[PDB]
Symmetry: C3
Subunit: 560 residues, 3 copies
C-alpha cells in the first residue's frame, strides 16, 4: 500500500512533554512488608480546554540602504476595519530609539488594505495577510489551550497569554486573574464574526474578547464557563503492582509504569469528599475487571481497595492481593495459632513474610534494573532521533525536538502520495560537486493547492528546506523511502522506482540465510587522477567521530 | 584465545538488505475472533543462482600537463589474445568529444602485453593486470548472482547485467529476455579456458558467453538450465502466532516475527497445485514438531493446517490451537447447548470469545509495543554502527554501510593474528601535533603474500586507509583491542600489550563492586604555558554535539 | 525532592573497566547433555588494598620572551624541610639540553617557602602548594591502590609505581619485587607526620616509605603485611544456569551473566586444598538458598555440587538439576529397564535426552540472541554517553570516558543545591551572536569554600569549563534540569524556575493521551532581513550528520 507522506513543521514549544529518567535501585531487598496487588493510578485531571484564538499583528520594516519589528493591531482596527470591512489600516505605530513612530506602507499615504488568504489550501490555521518600507497586516486563527487553573492559556505560537480564557466583564467570568491592565483588554458584546475567506458574516452574535500584547494582538470568543468535572482521571490501569514499606513510607513499583511512587502509609479519606462517588466506580470497576481477567483463578482479594496520595500528585487506588500458594501458608499458620480474614493476618507472621520479601524483592529489583536499562537506552535514542521516538510513544506520526532537557511535540500535516512528485535529478546546477544528499520533491497540501518545493526526509517525511547538501562524490548508489516503496538513484540521477517487496527484508532479528557475495571495490579510475572523493554512504558513528577530527585539524591549519 | 582479525572492504551494493520499520499498534483490542496457533511462514523461493563471472576492461588515461576513462575489451581480443596467448592488446578504443579515438600505451607502437596476477595471496577474486598515456588491461574473476526471474544477474562490482545468465544461442536457453542486441553478445562453443596464473589450457571444453557493456566486457560459462525446484522456502518456524480478524481480513502476529501479516480470510487451494506435496510435508512435519515440543501437554489441535497468502508474498501455514483451559469452556458450553469438533465450536460462543479476545488482545498489543520499542532502538543503532548490527543479525562478521534508507552487505576477509603486526608508534612524522587516533598495522593476507599497510579498527577490524587522524594531545592513555587482548599506548607511543583478563570486565549488566577511587587530574604543566589541548578520550555524544558548535562559530569568524 | 548536584572530574584511567562484547550463538542446538542447574561463579579474589599515598613535585617554568617541566622533590627536602619545618626549598634541579640545571624561584636567592592548602574546602585529596621563573612546590595526598600480586600500585593520577606497596627493609616486607634501585627509594623509621593544615605533628611514630620517579616523588606509610584471605570471591549468584557439553568441553550459559564459560569436562579437586572449606560454606550455603527460594517446589537436586575452572579464571560451583516433569521420565525409564540415583541415570537414556536437548537448546540460544541484542545496544550506548551508562552499571553517579576500547571510571563530588546558583543570563558579552548553549552556574563545594565558576551539565551535572558555546540564535526557548526541577530560559535570558511536576511526563513507554495542538511557526521577522539563524533546539542525529556535511563544503570553498 502507498503510505501517506508527512510534512512535519518544527514545534514551537506549546506542548513540552518531559520524559522520565533512571532511578537508584536497591542493592538488596530491604523494603519490609512486601505484597502484590492491582492498582489504578489516577493523574490530576488537568482538564485541557482547547479553543481557536486569533492573533493580529503588523510587520514593520525599513528599506534604507535595516530595522524590522512587529507591532500589534489596535482594538478599533480589529472591530471596525477588519471585523466589519475586512481590511487593514495601511499605517501602523511602532517604537524606535525609545520613541513612538508611525509607519507608512511603501512610503504611501493612509489607505485601506484588503486581507487575503495566505494559502489556497484548506488548513486549520487559516491565516491572512495584506502583502506577500513595508507594513504587512497579518491575521491568523491559531489554536490555543488552557489547563485546570485556567489562569493562562498558550497559543499555537508557544507564547503564553497571562490571562484566563474565561476572563471577561460579564457575570460568571474568571475575573480572579488578569496580568494585563484594563487598557490592554476589551470585551465586545453582540459581536458578529465574518470569515474573510467567504465574507458572509455570522448568523448569530457571540461576545468576543480582545487582548493586546507588546508584540501582537489576540482575540477569542468568550465562553461563559466550562462546568466542573471530576478532579481525577484514570492515567494507567496497572495490571501488576507491588507495595513495599520502607523508611516510614510505602513504595509502589510495577513493570509497565517505570516509576516508583512514595506515600505516607495512610490512606486518603476519599469517603469525606465527593470524589468517593466518581473514583468509587471508576477505580473499583476497573479493579474487578483486571482481577477477573487474570487473577480470578490464581489470587485472592485482600481487604477493600486502598487509596494513597503518592508523591508528585498521583493517586493510587491499590488493591492488595496474594497468590493462592501464599494463602495456604497464612491459613495454615492461622490454624496453628488458633490451636479467616487475610486483611489482618497479612504481615503478622514474620517467618512467612521473610521469604516472600526476598521473592518479591528480586522481582521489584529486576523491574528497576531492566527499566533503567530501557530508560537510559530510550533517553539516548530520544537525543538521537526525537521524531521516531516521539511518534512511537504517542502512537502516531508527530514532530518533536529537544528544547534543552525537555521535548517539544506538535502534530504533522499528512499529504497523499498522489500530490508528491520526486524530481528526476538531485544534482545542483549552482554548485558543481556540492549537490544534495536526498532527493528533491515538489508537492501540494491538497489537489487545489499550489505546488510547493521541498525535500524528501526520513520515513516518507517531507522537509520544506532544501538545505541537506553535501560534497557529493562519484560512484553514488542510494535508495530512499518514497511512499510504499523506494526510489533508487545512481550518480545523483533518478534511475527508477521499486516497490517495498523488491528488496530482501531482514524482518526477524536473526536472519542468517542472506545470499551474500564478496563485493569487489570497483571504483572509477577518476579517483586516482582527479582525486575526487568516492561514495561512502551515510556516515558511520565512528565516521562522524572521525570527520570532525579532520575538521579540527583543518581549523588548526588555519590558526597556524 | 587469539581471535582472528578481519579486513572488511566497503560493500558495493550487490546485496541490499532493507530492514523492518515500526507499526501502528492498536490502542485497544479491536480484532475479533482471536485465537492462538502454530505457523510456518514461507517466502517465495527466490533460488539464488551463484556463479563466477569474469570482467574485462582497459583503463585509458592521458598524461597531458587530465582525461581518464574506462573502455571494454572486444570479443576477438578475449577469445584470441587473452584466452589463447594470455596477453592484452596494447592499443584500445575510447571516445572523446563525441568522437571515437584510439589510445596507445605510453605513446608506444602496438605490442602484446602479458597479464600478471594483481596479488600473491590466494583470493576468490583472482584479478589480473598488465600495468601496475597508460592503457592498463584488466581481467577479474568477480562473483555473480541471479534470482527467480533469471532475467538479470548482478556482479560483485554491483553493476547489473540486463540479460539472463542462461541466455544463449543453444537449445534450452533463456532467450525470452536480453536487453542487449546481438552485436553486443556472443557465445563460443568448444571454448577452452586457461588460468592466466598457470597457462593450463582446459582439458574439457565448455561453452562460454560474452557480453560487452558501455564500460566493460563480461564473460561466464553457460550452464544449460538449472532444474525447477519448489516455489516456497521455509523462512521462519513460528513457535507462537496469534490470528486476529479485523476489517474483513485476518491479522497474524507473533513475538519473534516483528511484523503483522494480512490475508483475505480465505485459504489458498494448495491441493490444486503440485506445491501441495512440497509444502504438505515441509509444513505439516514442522507443525507436529513444534506442537510435540511445547504444546502437546497444554494445547489441543483445532482443524487441519490452513494456508493463507499474506500481503507481501508470504504464505502462512497456520494451525489453529487453544489452551486446555479454554477447551473446558468450549466443551462445557457445548454440553449446555446440547441439552465433539472444536473446529466448528470455535468463535460460536460470543460470551466465551469476548474474554479471550481481551486476554490475547493484550498479548498481541504487548508484542507490538515491545517490538516497536526494539525496532526503533535497533534502527537507530543501524545508523550508528551498521557493521556491528549487520554482523550480529547475519550471525557472522560482516561489512555493511547504509546506501540511503537501505543497508548494503558484503563479507569480510579473515586474516590470522600471526600475520598482523602493530607498529611501535602512532606519531606522524609529517605533521607535528596531528598524529593518528588508532594504532597503525602492517599485515599480509597470506603467509607468502606481501606486507600491506593498514590501520587498526574496532573489534579487531583492519582498515586499509590510514586516514583516522586527529589533533593529537598530551597525556594520552588509551587501550585498543588487538587479537585476544589489548594494546596499551601512552603519549601516542606503543607501551605494551596486555591480555583480555588483565582488565576488570563488567560481564553482568549490574556490577557495583568496582574498586573505584577518586581520580586526580595530574595534567602536564605544558597545558598552561604551551596552551596545547589535553587528552579527552573518545568524544562523548554531547561532546560531538558540542565540538561542531565550535566549528560553526569558527566559520562565523571566517564569514565576518 | 531537590536532588544534589554533581561535579564529575575527568577520570585519569586509574580504574579501567572493559565491558563484554557479542558472541557467536549456535545456528541450531548442537550441544549434547544440556542440563539445568544452580551455579555460583567465583572470581579470583583480587583483594584491592587501598591506601592514601602522598606525591611531592615542583613545577619549573621559564619566563623568557617557553621551557617548562616537572621535577621531583629530594628525600632530604621531604623528611627535613617539608616534614619538620613544613616548608619547601625555593631552588630546584631540572634537566635541560640533556644537562642537569638548577632553577630559582622568581629569579630570587635560596629561601624557604611555606606550603599552604590548595583549597579551603575539605577534600579527600587535600593538596598543598607554595605558589598560586617559577618553582611551585606541590604536595598532594592522592589515593592509591594495589592488587593480589602486590608488585605494583596505581596512584589516583593513573601513573603506575613499579614497586610493591609493602616493600621495605624491615622484616616481613615484599622485597621480592622493586623496579627502582636503592638510590631512588628510602624507608624512614620512627617517622612523625604533621598535617600541613594544622602543623599538628604525630604522637605515635610510624615508618614511612619514599620513592622518587623521573617526574615526581611519592611517599606512603608502610604497613607490615595484609594477612592472607580466601583466594576466591563470590562474583555472581546465578539463579538459573544451563550446562552444555560440546567439543570435549562443557558450556555454561545463563540469562543474567551475558557470557558463556568453557571448562575441561573435569571437576577441580577443591577438597585437596584449604579452599574446599572456605568455598565449601560460601557456595553450598548459597546453593541451598537459591534452591530453597524457587527450585524446592519444582526441581530435584542431582548429585553433589560440582566445581569447574572455566576459561578466563572463573570458578563455577555448578549444581545440576532437572524439573520434576523430567524426573518422572527418568524414573519411568529406570523402572522399564529394571524389568534411584539421578546422578547416574542422567544422560543415560538418549531418547529422553534428545528432546530436552532441543528444549533447553532453544532457551540457551534465545538468551544468546537477546543478550547479543542488548550487548550491542548497550555497547553503542556506552560510546554515545558513557556517563549515564557508567552510572547505571555501577549503581551510583560516576564519571567515565572512553580511553579507546576501554572505559575509565572514577567517582564524582556531590554538592548540595543550596550552594549552587544559576546565573540570570547566558548571553556572552565578549562575543555577540555566539552566546553559551547551557546555563552558567557559580557554586562552592562547601559553605565555607570559595565560589568557583562553572557550567550546568546534563542531569544536574556541574562542569568546570564554560566551553559549551554555540552560534546562538533568536526565538530560543529551552528547559534545563536544575535540582529537583527545571530552569526555563528564553532569548538566552533567565525567565523563571519551575518544578518537576510542572511538565507533562511520559513515564509509561506508551502515553498517547497528550493534549497536543498544531504548533504554528511564529518566527521573528528579522530572520528574513538580518538573515540570522532561528532556534532549532538540540541537533538531531540527522542534523549532526547534515551540519558536518556543510563543514566539508565550507572547507571545499576554502580549498578552492
Ligand atoms: C506526608 O506527611 C507530611 C507531614 O505531614 C507532609 O508534609 C507536610 O505537608 C504540608 C502540606 O500538605 C506542609 O504544610 C505547608 O508547609 C509550608 C511550611 O512548611 C507552607 O507552605 C504552608 O503553610 C503549609 O503549612 C507541611 O509543612 C509538611 N510538613 C512536613 C513535616 O514536611 C507531606 O506532604 C505528606 N506527603 C504526602 C505524599 O502525602
Ligand atoms: C484479496 O482479494 C482482492 C480482490 O480479489 C485482491 O485484489 C485483486 O488482485 C488482483 C490480482 O490478484 C487484481 O487484478 C489485477 O489488477 C490490475 C487492475 O486493477 C491489473 O494489473 C490486472 O489486469 C489484474 O486484473 C485486482 O485488480 C485486485 N482487485 C482489487 C479490488 O483490488 C487482492 O490481491 C487479494 N489479496 C490477497 C493478499 O490475497
Ligand atoms: C584444559 O586442559 C588443557 C590440557 O591439559 C590445559 O592446557 C594446558 O595448560 C597448562 C597450564 O595449565 C600448560 O602448561 C604450561 O604451558 C606452557 C608451555 O606450553 C608453559 O608456560 C608452562 O611450562 C606449562 O607447561 C599446557 O601447555 C597446556 N596444554 C595444552 C595442550 O594446551 C588447559 O589449560 C585446560 N583448561 C582449563 C580451562 O582448565
Ligand atoms: C509491617 O506490618 C506490620 C503489621 O501491620 C506492622 O506492625 C504493626 O505496626 C503497627 C503500626 O504501624 C502497630 O500498631 C502494630 O502493633 C504492629 N503489629 C501488628 C501485629 O499489627 C509493621 O510495623 C510493619 N513493618 C514495617 C517495617 O513497617
Ligand atoms: C467470527 O467467526 C464467526 C464464526 O465463523 C463468524 O460468524 C459466521 O460467519 C459465517 C461466514 O463466515 C456465517 O455463515 C455464519 O452464520 C456466522 N455465524 C456463525 C455462528 O457461524 C464471524 O463473522 C466472525 N467475526 C468477524 C468479526 O469476522
Ligand atoms: C553424555 O554423558 C554420558 C554419560 O556420562 C556420556 O556417556 C559415557 O561416556 C563415558 C566416557 O566419557 C563412557 O565411559 C560411558 O560408558 C558412557 N556412558 C555412560 C552411561 O556413562 C557421553 O559421552 C556424554 N556425551 C557427550 C556427547 O559428551
Ligand atoms: C471467578 O472464580 C469463581 C470461583 O471459581 C467463579 O465462580 C467465577 O465464575 C469466576 N469468574 C470468571 C469471570 O472467570
Ligand atoms: C538456509 O536455511 C536453511 C533452512 O531453510 C538452512 O538449513 C541453511 O543452513 C541456511 N543457509 C545458511 C547459509 O545459513
Ligand atoms: C503427547 O501427549 C499424548 C497424550 O498425553 C501422549 O500419548 C504422547 O506420548 C505425547 N507425546 C510426546 C512426544 O510427548
Ligand atoms: C562487594 O560485594 C559484596 C558481596 O560479595 C557486598 O557485600 C559488598 O557490599 C560489595 N561492595 C560494594 C562496594 O558494593
Ligand atoms: C521443600 O519441599 C519439601 C517437600 O515438599 C518440604 O518438606 C520443605 O518444607 C520445603 N522447604 C521449603 C524451605 O519450602
Ligand atoms: C484519553 O484517555 C481516555 C481514557 O482515559 C480515552 O478514552 C481517550 O481515547 C484518550 N484520548 C486519546 C486521544 O487517545
Amino acid at each position: 500500500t502507498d503510505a501517506n507522506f508527512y510534512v512535519c513543521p518544527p514545534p514551537t514549544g506549546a506542548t513540552v512533554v518531559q520524559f522520565e529518567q533512571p532511578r537508584r535501585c536497591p542493592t538488596r531487598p530491604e523494603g519490609q512488608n512486601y505484597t502484590e496487588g492491582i492498582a489504578v493510578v489516577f493523574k490530576e485531571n488537568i482538564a485541557p480546554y482547547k479553543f481557536k484564538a486569533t492573533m493580529y499583528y503588523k510587520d514593520v520594516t525599513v528599506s534604507q540602504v535595516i530595522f524590522e519589528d512587529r507591532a500589534p493591531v489596535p482594538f478599533e482596527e480589529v472591530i471596525d476595519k477588519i471585523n466589519a470591512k475586512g481590511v487593514c489600516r495601511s499605517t501602523a505605530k511602532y517604537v524606535r530609539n525609545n520613541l513612538e513612530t508611525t509607519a507608512f506602507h511603501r512610503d504611501d499615504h493612509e489607505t485601506d488594505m484588503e486581507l487575503k488568504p495566505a494559502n489556497a489550501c484548506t488548513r486549520t490555521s487559516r491565516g491572512w495577510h495584506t502583502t506577500d518600507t513595508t507594513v504587512n497586516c497579518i491575521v491568523e486563527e491559531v489554536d490555543a489551550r488552557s489547563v485546570y487553573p485556567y489562569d493562562e492559556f498558550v497559543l499555537a505560537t508557544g507564547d503564553f497569554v497571562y490571562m484566563s480564557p474565561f476572563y471577561g466583564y460579564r457575570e460568571g467570568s474568571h475575573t480572579e486573574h488578569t496580568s494585563y491592565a484594563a487598557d490592554r483588554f476589551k470585551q465586545v458584546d453582540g459581536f458578529y464574526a465574518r470569515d474573510l475567506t467567504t465574507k458572509a458574516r455570522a448568523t448569530a452574535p457571540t461576545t468576543r474578547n480582545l487582548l493586546t500584547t507588546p508584540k501582537f494582538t489576540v482575540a477569542w470568543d468568550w465562553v461563559p464557563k466550562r462546568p466542573s468535572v471530576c478532579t481525577m482521571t484514570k492515567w494507567q490501569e496497572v495490571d501488576e503492582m507491588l507495595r513495599s514499606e520502607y523508611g516510614g513510607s510505602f513504595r509502589f513499583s510495577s513493570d509497565a509504569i517505570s516509576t516508583t511512587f512514595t506515600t505516607n502509609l495512610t490512606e486518603y479519606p476519599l469517603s469525606r469528599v465527593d470524589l468517593g462517588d466518581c473514583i468509587g466506580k471508576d477505580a473499583r470497576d476497573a479493579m474487578d475487571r483486571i482481577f477477573a481477567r487474570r487473577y480470578n483463578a490464581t489470587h485472592i482479594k485482600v481487604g477493600q481497595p486502598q487509596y494513597y496520595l503518592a508523591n508528585g500528585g498521583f493517586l493510587i487506588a491499590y488493591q492488595p492481593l496474594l497468590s493462592n500458594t501464599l494463602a495456604e501458608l497464612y491459613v495454615r499458620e492461622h490454624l496453628r495459632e488458633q490451636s479467616i480474614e487475610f486483611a489482618r493476618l497479612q504481615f503478622t507472621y514474620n517467618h512467612i513474610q521473610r521469604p516472600v520479601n526476598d521473592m518479591l524483592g528480586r522481582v521489584a529489583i529486576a523491574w528497576c534494573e531492566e527499566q533503567n536499562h530501557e530508560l537510559t537506552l530510550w533517553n539516548e535514542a530520544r537525543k538521537l532521533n526525537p521524531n521516531a521516538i516521539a511518534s512511537v510513544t504517542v502512537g502516531r506520526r508527530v514532530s518533536a525536538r529537544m528544547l534543552g532537557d525537555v521535548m517539544a511535540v506538535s502534530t504533522c500535516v499528512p499529504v497523499a502520495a498522489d500530490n508528491v512528485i520526486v524530481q528526476n535529478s538531485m544534482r545542483i546546477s549552482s554548485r558543481p560537486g556540492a549537490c544534495y544528499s536526498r532527493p528533491l520533491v515538489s508537492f501540494r497540501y491538497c489537489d487545489q493547492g499550489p505546488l510547493v518545493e521541498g525535500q524528501l526526509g526520513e520515513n516518507n517525511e517531507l522537509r520544506l528546506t532544501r538545505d541537506a547538501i553535501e560534497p557529493c562524490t562519484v560512484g553514488h548508489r542510494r535508495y530512499f523511502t518514497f511512499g510504499g516503496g523506494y526510489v533508487y538513484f545512481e550518480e545523483y540521477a533518478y534511475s527508477h522506482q521499486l516497490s517495498r517487496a523488491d528488496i530482501t527484508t531482514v524482518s526477524t532479528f536473526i536472519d542468517l540465510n542472506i545470499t551474500m557475495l564478496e563485493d569487489h571495490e570497483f571504483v572509477p579510475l577518476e579517483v586516482y587522477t582527479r582525486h575526487e572523493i568516492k561514495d561512502s554512504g551515510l556516515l558511520d558513528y565512528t565516521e562522524v567521530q572521525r570527520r570532525n577530527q579532520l575538521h579540527d585539524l583543518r581549523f588548526a591549519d588555519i590558526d597556524t
